[PDB]
């Protein structure tokens, strides 16, 4: 029938005719986006020997530096690791164009004051987080090193 | 076909075949290959009023771009945020339709415009509708122009 359609005549003369073109079709589609986060030593920031006091917290911008929370999940050494907006694997995979990191030392009870829309002594004058926050807050007990 | 709808004078430009606009993307879409005439006349005298009725409405948010000559009447809240709207307005949830706001002394650019879209099948279709074209006695067996 393909031969009849190419000829445009129902009757087909004896012979060999190319009436179609065959191309292998992809089983699946693979999609990779242009890398935007960049690279850095993410582990070193966690391993830093000293952290700034809460009243004057140091600010380091995570820009042009890798975003990797897979190691953080494996370590499991953080007393509180809340995540916001999306599931933890989903944020880990997504590239982040600009991230902001704030480093400070507070008591475990004091950490609650540093939370979105949270009012406390540490939340009113030490530092403050906006009510709508998509960022993930990481807190780990430092009694072994900080306490003396 | 007569299509009656409400749009601002600047918005009328957005509703054109081969033209991309916020109005074209969500509330109403005009086909790129569509054949016809779109007629717009200022309705500032009648549609705009001291009352400023909000009966006219347009779709601010749509999940997908409208297909050409397709109508969406859904009032379900758009789930822009990860949190579900649950069928009610919520933080990070925006109503799909925004009520039109019009002013009696609105400027010509901001004047409400009544817009009618006409589509014609034309050739290859029995002529149910005809131009006045006063008919002239048919002539046969001679070479003559025929319509």
């Amino acid at each position: 029938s393909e031969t009849k359609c190419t000829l445009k005549s129902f009757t087909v003369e004896k012979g060999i005719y190319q009436t179609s073109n065959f191309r292998v079709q992809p089983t699946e589609s693979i999609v990779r986006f242009p890398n935007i986060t960049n690279l850095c030593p993410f582990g070193e920031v966690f391993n830093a020997t000293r952290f700034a006091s809460v009243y004057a917290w140091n600010r380091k911008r995570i820009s042009n530096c890798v975003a990797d929370y897979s190691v953080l999940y494996n370590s499991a050494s953080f007393s509180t690791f809340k995540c916001y907006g999306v599931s933890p694997t989903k944020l880990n995979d997504l590239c982040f164009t600009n991230v902001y990191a704030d480093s400070f030392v507070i008591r475990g009870d004091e950490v609650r004051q540093i939370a979105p829309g949270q009012t406390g002594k540490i939340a009113d004058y030490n530092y403050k987080l906006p009510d709508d926050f998509t960022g993930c807050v990481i807190a780990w007990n430092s009694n072994n090193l900080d306490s003396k | 076909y007569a299509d009656s709808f409400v749009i601002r004078g600047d918005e009328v430009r957005q509703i054109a075949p081969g033209q991309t606009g916020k109005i074209a993307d969500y509330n109403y879409k005009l086909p790129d290959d569509f054949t016809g005439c779109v007629i717009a006349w200022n309705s500032n005298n009648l549609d705009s009023k001291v009352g400023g009725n909000y009966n006219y409405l347009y779709r601010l948010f749509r999940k997908s771009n409208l297909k050409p000559f397709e109508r969406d009447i859904s009032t379900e809240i758009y789930q822009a945020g990860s949190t579900p709207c649950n069928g009610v307005e919520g933080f990070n949830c925006y109503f799909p339709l925004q009520s039109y706001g019009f002013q009696p002394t609105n400027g010509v650019g901001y004047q409400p415009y009544r817009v009618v879209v006409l589509s014609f099948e034309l050739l290859h279709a029995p002529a149910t509708v005809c131009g006045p074209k006063k008919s002239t006695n048919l002539v046969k067996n001679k070479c003559v122009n025929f319509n």
Partner: antibody
Amino acid sequence: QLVQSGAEVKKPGATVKISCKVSGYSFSNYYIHWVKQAPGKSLEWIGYIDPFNGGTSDNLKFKGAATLTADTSTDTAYMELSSLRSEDTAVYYCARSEYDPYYVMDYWGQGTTVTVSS
Amino acid sequence: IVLTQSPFQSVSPKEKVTITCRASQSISSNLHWYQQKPDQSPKLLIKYASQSISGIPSRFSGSGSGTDFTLTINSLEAEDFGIYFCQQTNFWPYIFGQGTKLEIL
């Protein structure tokens, strides 16, 4: 006291959402913990949700696609289960939590089974 | 942070029966313990492994050194035993141990 939905059953690859209203205390004051116990098996902490601000913290030992949404006004904690699996066929319990790192859980929901069937 | 406290129990009642929280090499001063009943939403018994919350008869104490903790159920009868789960709070995934299905003569 906490109150969950009734016992439920669903097919694989569907999307399901369960609930747990809070009574006798402010929703913001106490955190909500979601714990899944497989029948005749150890308790597993699927995720913990912060009530005042919506939070999505989940255990990385297994992924159940457990999206967590919290609204302070509703006073109800919502857990969403998708891609149902044999592990997902377990009793699910909401739980009263401290608003602090101690995270003791002592007040619960009735416990709801989410059975997975062909 | 894996816990492996006590498979189950089989002992005459009324005795000082210990269940031995086998903690992971990482140590955490904080813990909890909960009592489970068949198809009953369990309830935390031992808060912080040393303090008592309101509403617990003192039949089962929680005494532990460092990572290891023991919930010595003192003079337990055939009225109380069910399952008893341990809880660990220091490590991010707050894992629960296999737990002890207490059984008795």
